[PDB]
Amino acid sequence: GRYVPFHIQVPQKFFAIKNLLLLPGSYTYEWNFRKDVNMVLQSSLGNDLR
Amino acid sequence: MTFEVDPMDEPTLLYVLFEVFDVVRVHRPHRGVIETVYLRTPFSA
Amino acid sequence: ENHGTEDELPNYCFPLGGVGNNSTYTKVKPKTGQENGWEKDATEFSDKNEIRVGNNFAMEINLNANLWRNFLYSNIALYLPDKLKYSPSNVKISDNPNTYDYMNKRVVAPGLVDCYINLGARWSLDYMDNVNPFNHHRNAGLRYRSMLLGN
Amino acid sequence: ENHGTEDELPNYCFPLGGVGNNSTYTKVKPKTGQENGWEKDATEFSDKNE
Amino acid sequence: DIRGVLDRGPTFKPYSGTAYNALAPKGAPNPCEWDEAATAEQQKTHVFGQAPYSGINITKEGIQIGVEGQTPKYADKTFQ
Amino acid sequence: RQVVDDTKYKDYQQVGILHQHNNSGFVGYLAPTMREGQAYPANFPYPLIGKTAVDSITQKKFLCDRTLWRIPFSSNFMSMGALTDLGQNLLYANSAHALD
């Protein structure tokens, strides 16, 4: 279907962060995400989704 | 550098990867503290 | 995994002779002094000349839908639970439902597994989920051990 | 490896029209105050209905 | 773990072919009525039909498809 | 997979197999028999894609065939020996216990 309530599990892909082992304390961890359909979705013919 | 290619009738891009070393050292002196030293050579930041 | 089939180009069947049915024509030749004058030609040519006007006689078929429908029936539909089956109209069947004869004669409605079931989705059929899929004829290993024995 | 043909359901090919050889039928209307009275109609309808 | 609701819109199509009357010829129209020009304005309704069902009779009450003991039973027009 | 709604979908009618006629007059009626009927429009199923796409709910499941479900009796649930760390502890090995 066109209409989809979803749940997805996203990994941190950045090399320095991901192989790190983190010791005691508290930390700020903040990220940014894109909402533009032509980047987050992908279409077969490569049509402008907006 | 001089690269020779086929005539393409619609704009294209030459994608060049310069292979360098890109290392990071990570230091945690006290509880909740993190310091980092970055080095990338060739091409220093 | 219902992803549909190629159906872009129509497929056609034609007579053995290509052409199909034809009608009988006499030749004619023009009168040269007129703009529109004609005269029968029965010189060295036959009076019973075969002509088909139009394109050749045909029937049209979609191949891949026929194949798909047969696949869906062969590999899933016939293997649906017996509460979903029925017994043949005006024919005998076994008393014992544990027999090959009862399993060969119970009638399943083809409309239960038609070409558009779960179209665009990856999903096993809920009535076949309770059913042992190793009890099926596309078991290559059991088929191989039977053919080690013979025909 | 002859395991015989998968051919339980019959497969069919049909004419371009999906119909084929037909006959011509004339529309008729009922006479409403009679049980089984009927009258020929060639007014707004074509008299040769395929 | 990211959750949300998506709409992939009306241009999406995850299958090749049609779902609907798949075994029908690509040229064949549905059985139909049309006004065609005669003039003998005076345009005549032509029908292209097909009647596959054999019933018991035809009265003004429709085609008879059965009996309710003594009484004859006729086709419900809503779907039959 | 996605299936049609009946909670916020207002137009809904449940049409049975007995009167479904997608592919009418190309195939036998609810039997593997020869072609029956005439050509006509198709009534089933509703479109789950396209401009007129009906409201839909989501059904999720999985299969996992040819396997056993596994609950190893161990502190951290790793393979650190064929003799289990929890099978060795003074609470569970040197006392007796009933299980429910």
Distance of residue E20 Cα from the nearest chain A Cα, in angstroms = 17
What's the token pair of residue C47?
A: 């009076």
Residue numbers in F near E26 (CB within 8 A): none
Q: 10 Å Cβ neighbour count for E74?
A: 19
Burial class (CB in 10 A: 0-12, 13-18, 19+), F21: middle
CB atoms closer than 10 angstroms to residue E35: 14
Q: Which residues of D touch E49 (CB under 8 A)?
A: 25, 49-50
Distance CA F31, CA B11 (A): 60
Record: contact E50-F38, CB cut-off 8 A? yes
CB F37 within 8 A of CB F29: yes
Calpha distance F57→C127 (Å, rounded): 20
Backbone φ/ψ region at E13: left (φ over 0), alpha (ψ -120 to 50), beta: beta
Do F1 and C123 lie within an 8 Å CB cutoff? yes
As to burial, measured by CB atoms within 10 angstroms (0-12 exposed, 13-18 middle, 19+ buried), residue A6 is exposed
Q: How many CB pairs under 8 A join D and F?
A: 16
- The answer to whether C27 and C40 have CB atoms below 8 angstroms apart is yes
Model resolution, angstroms = 7.4
> Mapping DSSP to helix (H, G, I), strand (E, B) and coil, where does residue F3 land?
strand
CB contacts < 8 A (E, F): 43
**φ, ψ of residue A24 in degrees (nearest 5):** -45, 140
The contact set of E with C (CB < 8 A) is 14-19, 22-23, 25-27
Of residues C134, C87, C84, the one with CA closest to residue C106: C87
E-state strands within chain C: 11-13, 23-25, 27-30, 38-41, 49-51, 59-61
CA geometry: angle D35, D40, D44, nearest 5 deg = 120
D26 touches chain E (CB under 8 A): no
Nearest to F31 among C107, C112, C121 (CB): C107
Deposited experimental method: cryo-EM
